């Protein structure tokens, strides 16, 4: 995701 990701899905966890 173009915002907050890193591992897999950090915005909608």
The largest sheet, given as strand count, sense and whether it forms a barrel, is: none
Q: Label the overall shape.
A: globular
Number of helices: 0
The N- to C-terminal Cα distance equals 12 Å
Overall structural class, as computed from helix and strand content, comes to little secondary structure
Helicity level = under 10%
In angstroms, what is the radius of gyration? Answer: 6 Å
Strand portion? under 5%
The count of DSSP E runs of length 2 or more, i.e. the number of strands, is: 0
PDB class: viral protein
Keywords: cyclic peptide, peptidomimetics, HIV, gp41, lactam bond, Viral protein
Assembly: monomeric
Entry title: solution structure of lactam analogue (EDap) of HIV gp41 600-612 loop.
Tell me about this structure.
There is one protein chain. With 13 residues, the protein is largely without helices or strands. It is 0% helix and 0% strand. It has no helices and no strands. The radius of gyration is 6 Å and the shape is globular. The N and C termini lie close together (12 Å).
How would you briefly describe this protein structure?
The protein is mostly loops.
Task: Quickly list its features.
monomer; 13 residues; little secondary structure; 0% helix
Give a topology summary.
Elements lengths: L13
PDB class: viral protein
Keywords: cyclic peptide, peptidomimetics, Viral protein
Assembly: monomeric
